[PDB]
PDB file of C-alpha atoms in Angstrom:
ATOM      1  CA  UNK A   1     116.559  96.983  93.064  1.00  0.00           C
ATOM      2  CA  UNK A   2     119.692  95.630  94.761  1.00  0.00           C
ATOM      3  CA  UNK A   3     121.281  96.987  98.229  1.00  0.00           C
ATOM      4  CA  UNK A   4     124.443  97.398  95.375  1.00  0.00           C
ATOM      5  CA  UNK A   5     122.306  99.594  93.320  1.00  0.00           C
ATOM      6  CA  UNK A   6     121.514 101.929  96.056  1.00  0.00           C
ATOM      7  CA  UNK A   7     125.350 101.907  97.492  1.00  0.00           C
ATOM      8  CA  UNK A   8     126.013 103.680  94.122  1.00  0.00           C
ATOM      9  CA  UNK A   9     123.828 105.958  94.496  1.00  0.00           C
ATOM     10  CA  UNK A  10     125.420 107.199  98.186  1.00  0.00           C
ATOM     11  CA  UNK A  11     128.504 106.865  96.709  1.00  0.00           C
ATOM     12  CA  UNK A  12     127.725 109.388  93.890  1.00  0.00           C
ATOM     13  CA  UNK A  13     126.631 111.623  96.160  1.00  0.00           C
ATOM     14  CA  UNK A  14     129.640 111.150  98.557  1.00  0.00           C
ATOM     15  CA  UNK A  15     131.695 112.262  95.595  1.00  0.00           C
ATOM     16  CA  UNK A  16     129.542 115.353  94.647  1.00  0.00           C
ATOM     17  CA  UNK A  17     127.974 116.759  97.715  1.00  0.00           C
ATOM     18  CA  UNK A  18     129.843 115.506 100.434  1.00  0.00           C
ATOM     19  CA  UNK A  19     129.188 117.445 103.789  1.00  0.00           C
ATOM     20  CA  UNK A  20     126.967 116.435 106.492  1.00  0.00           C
ATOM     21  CA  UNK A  21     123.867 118.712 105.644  1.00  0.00           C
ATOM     22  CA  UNK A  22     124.075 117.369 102.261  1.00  0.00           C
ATOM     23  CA  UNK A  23     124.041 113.831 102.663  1.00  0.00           C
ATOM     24  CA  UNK A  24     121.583 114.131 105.078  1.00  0.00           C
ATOM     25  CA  UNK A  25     119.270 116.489 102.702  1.00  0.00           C
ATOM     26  CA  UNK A  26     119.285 112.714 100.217  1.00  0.00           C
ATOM     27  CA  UNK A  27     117.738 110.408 102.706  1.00  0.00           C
ATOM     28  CA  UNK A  28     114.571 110.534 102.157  1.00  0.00           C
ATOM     29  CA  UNK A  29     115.699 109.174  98.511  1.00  0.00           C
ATOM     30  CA  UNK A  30     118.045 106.911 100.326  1.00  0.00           C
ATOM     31  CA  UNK A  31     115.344 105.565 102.064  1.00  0.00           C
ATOM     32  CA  UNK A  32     112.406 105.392  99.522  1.00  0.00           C
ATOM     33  CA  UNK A  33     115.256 103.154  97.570  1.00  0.00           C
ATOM     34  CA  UNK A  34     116.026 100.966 100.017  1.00  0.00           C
ATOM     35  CA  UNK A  35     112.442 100.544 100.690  1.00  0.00           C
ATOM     36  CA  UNK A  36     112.563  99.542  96.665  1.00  0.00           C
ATOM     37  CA  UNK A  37     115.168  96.779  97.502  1.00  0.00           C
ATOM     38  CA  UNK A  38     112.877  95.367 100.208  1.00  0.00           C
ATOM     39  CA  UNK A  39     115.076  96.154 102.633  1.00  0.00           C
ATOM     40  CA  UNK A  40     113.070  97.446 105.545  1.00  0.00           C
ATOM     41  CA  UNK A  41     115.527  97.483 108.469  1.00  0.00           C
ATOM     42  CA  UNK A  42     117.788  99.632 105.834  1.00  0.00           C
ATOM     43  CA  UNK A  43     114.894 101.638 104.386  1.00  0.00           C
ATOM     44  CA  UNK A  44     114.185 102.711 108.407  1.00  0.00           C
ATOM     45  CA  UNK A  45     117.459 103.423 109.518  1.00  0.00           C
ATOM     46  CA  UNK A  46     118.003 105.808 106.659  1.00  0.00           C
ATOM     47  CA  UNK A  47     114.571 107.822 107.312  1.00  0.00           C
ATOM     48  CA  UNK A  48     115.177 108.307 110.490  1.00  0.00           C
ATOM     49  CA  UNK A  49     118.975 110.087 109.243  1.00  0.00           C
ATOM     50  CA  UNK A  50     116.716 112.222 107.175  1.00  0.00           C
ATOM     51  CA  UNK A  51     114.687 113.222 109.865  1.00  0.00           C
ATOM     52  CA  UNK A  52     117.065 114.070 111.976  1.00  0.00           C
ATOM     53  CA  UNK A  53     117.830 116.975 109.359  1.00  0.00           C
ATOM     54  CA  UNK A  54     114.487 117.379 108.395  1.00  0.00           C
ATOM     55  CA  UNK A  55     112.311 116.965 111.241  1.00  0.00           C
ATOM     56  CA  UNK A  56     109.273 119.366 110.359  1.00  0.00           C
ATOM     57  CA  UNK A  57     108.617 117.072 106.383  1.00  0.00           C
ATOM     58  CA  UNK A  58     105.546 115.847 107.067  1.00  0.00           C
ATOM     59  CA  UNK A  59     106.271 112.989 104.022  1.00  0.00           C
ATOM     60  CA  UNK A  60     109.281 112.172 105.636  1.00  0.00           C
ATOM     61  CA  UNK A  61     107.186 111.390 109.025  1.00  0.00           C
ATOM     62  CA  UNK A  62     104.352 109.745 107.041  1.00  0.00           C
ATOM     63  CA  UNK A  63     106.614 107.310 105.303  1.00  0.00           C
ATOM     64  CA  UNK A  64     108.686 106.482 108.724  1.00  0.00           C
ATOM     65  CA  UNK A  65     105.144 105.550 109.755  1.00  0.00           C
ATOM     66  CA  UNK A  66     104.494 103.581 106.898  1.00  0.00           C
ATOM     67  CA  UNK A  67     107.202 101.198 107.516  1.00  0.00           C
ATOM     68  CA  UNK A  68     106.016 100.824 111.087  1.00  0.00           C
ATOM     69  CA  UNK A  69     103.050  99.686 110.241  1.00  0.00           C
ATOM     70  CA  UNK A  70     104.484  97.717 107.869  1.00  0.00           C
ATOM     71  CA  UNK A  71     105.806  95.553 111.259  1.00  0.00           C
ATOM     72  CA  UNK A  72     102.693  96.391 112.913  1.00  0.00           C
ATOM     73  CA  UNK A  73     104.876  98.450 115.454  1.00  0.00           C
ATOM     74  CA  UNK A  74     101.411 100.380 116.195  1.00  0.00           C
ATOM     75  CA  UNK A  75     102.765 102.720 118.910  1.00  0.00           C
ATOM     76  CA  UNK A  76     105.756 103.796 116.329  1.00  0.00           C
ATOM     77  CA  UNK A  77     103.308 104.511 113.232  1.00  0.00           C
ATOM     78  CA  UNK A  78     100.616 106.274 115.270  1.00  0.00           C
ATOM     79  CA  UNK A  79     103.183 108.365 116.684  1.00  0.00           C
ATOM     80  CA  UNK A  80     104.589 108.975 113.048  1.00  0.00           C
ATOM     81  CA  UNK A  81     101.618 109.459 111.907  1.00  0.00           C
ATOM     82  CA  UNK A  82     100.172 112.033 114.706  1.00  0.00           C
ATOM     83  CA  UNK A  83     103.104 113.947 113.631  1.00  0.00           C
ATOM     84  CA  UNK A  84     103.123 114.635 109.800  1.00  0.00           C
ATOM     85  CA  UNK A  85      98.888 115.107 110.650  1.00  0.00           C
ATOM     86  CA  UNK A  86     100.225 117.521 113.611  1.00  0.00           C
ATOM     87  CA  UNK A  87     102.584 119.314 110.480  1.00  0.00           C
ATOM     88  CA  UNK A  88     100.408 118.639 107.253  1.00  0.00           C
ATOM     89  CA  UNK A  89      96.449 119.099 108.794  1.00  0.00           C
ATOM     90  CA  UNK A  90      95.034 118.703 105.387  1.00  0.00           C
ATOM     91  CA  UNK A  91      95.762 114.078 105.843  1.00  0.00           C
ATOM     92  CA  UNK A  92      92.503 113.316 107.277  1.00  0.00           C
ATOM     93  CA  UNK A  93      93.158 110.034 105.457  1.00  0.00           C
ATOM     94  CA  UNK A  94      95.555 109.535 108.439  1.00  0.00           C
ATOM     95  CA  UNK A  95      93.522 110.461 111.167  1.00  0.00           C
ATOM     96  CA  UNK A  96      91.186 107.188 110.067  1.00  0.00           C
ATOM     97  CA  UNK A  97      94.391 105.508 109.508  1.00  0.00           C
ATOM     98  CA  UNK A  98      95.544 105.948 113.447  1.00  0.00           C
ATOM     99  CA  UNK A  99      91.841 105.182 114.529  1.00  0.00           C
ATOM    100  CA  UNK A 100      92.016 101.478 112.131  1.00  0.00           C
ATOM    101  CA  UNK A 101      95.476 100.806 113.894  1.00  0.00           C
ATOM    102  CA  UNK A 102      94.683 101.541 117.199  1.00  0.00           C
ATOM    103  CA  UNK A 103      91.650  99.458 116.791  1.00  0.00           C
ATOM    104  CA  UNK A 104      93.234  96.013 114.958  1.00  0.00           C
ATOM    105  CA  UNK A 105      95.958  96.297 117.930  1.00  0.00           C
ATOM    106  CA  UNK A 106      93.838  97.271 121.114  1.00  0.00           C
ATOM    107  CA  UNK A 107      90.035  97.532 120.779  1.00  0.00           C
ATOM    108  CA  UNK A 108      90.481  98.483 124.665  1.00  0.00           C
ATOM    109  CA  UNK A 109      92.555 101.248 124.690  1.00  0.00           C
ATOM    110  CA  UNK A 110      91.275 104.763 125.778  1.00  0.00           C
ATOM    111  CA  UNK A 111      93.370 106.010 122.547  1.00  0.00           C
ATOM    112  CA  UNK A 112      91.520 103.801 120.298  1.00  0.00           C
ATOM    113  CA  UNK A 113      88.213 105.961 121.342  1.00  0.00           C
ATOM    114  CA  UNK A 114      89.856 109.098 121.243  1.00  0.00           C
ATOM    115  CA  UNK A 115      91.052 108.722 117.473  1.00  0.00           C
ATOM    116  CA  UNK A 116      88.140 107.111 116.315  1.00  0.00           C
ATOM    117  CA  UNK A 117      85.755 110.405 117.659  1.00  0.00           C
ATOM    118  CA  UNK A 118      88.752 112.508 115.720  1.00  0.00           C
ATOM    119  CA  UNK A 119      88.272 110.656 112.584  1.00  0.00           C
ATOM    120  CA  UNK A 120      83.964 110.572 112.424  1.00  0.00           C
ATOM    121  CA  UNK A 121      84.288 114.386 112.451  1.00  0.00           C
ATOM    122  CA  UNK A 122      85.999 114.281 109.301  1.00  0.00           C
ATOM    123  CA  UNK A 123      84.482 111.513 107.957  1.00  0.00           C
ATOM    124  CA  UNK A 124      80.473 111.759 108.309  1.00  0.00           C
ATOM    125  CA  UNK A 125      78.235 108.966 108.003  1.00  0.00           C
ATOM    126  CA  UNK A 126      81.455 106.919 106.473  1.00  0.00           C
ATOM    127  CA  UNK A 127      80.737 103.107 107.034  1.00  0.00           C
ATOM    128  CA  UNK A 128      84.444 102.236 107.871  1.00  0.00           C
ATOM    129  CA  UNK A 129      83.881 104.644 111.118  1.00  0.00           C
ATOM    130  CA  UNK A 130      80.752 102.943 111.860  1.00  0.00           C
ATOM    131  CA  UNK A 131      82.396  99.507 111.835  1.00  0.00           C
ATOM    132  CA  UNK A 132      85.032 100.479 114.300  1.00  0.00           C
ATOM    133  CA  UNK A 133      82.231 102.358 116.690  1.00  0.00           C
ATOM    134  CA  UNK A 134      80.794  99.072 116.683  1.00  0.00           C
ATOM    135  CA  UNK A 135      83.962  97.101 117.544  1.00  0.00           C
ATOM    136  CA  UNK A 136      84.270  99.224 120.207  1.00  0.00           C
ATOM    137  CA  UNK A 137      80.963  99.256 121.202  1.00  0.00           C
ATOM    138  CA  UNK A 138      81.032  95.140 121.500  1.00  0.00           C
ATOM    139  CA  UNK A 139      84.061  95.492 123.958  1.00  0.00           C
ATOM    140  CA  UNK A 140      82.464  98.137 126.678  1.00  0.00           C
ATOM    141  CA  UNK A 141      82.101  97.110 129.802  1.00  0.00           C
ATOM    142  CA  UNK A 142      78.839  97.361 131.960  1.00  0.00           C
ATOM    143  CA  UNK A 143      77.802  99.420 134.635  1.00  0.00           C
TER     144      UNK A 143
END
């Protein structure tokens, strides 16, 4: 998919639905296109128009975080991330997603604890906790 192929698209619905509210109610498809095109910088700018509109869409959130971490901005995708968890509950697959970035970026960092002990609740005796506990574990200091 080209940037010209999704410029249609806007244009068409320039021409049909044209008010503010609208256009704004597309961007998520905007956005999930440009992300087609490989264009990233495009793809985010056009999420975060859809948010705007839309800020309680825990997809719309989730993807915004996806392209984050796609730059391995880890402070922007855990925060996009927190939310749509904070809005959709039922994404425990993103609570061990937060604890996994938090980790690659930080080992020390106080949050990297706190979302790891989040995500072995809901994910008992799951080997991919236990190999962050002891990443974490390896980095403690001594008293």
């Amino acid at each position: 998919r080209s940037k010209a192929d999704v410029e249609r698209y806007i244009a068409s619905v320039q021409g049909s639905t044209p008010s503010p509210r609208q256009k704004s109610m597309k961007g998520f498809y905007f956005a999930k296109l440009y992300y087609e095109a490989k264009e990233y910088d495009l793809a985010k700018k056009y999420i975060c128009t859809y948010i705007n509109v839309q800020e309680r869409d825990p997809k719309a959130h989730r993807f915004l975080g996806l392209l984050y971490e796609l730059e391995e901005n880890t402070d922007k995708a855990v925060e996009c991330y927190r939310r749509s968890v904070e809005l959709n509950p039922t994404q425990k697959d993103l609570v061990l997603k937060i604890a996994e970035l938090l980790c690659k970026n930080d080992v020390t960092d106080g949050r990297a604890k706190y979302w790891l002990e989040r995500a072995a609740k809901l994910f008992p005796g799951s080997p991919a906790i236990y190999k962050l506990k002891e990443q974490l574990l390896d980095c403690e200091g001594e008293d």
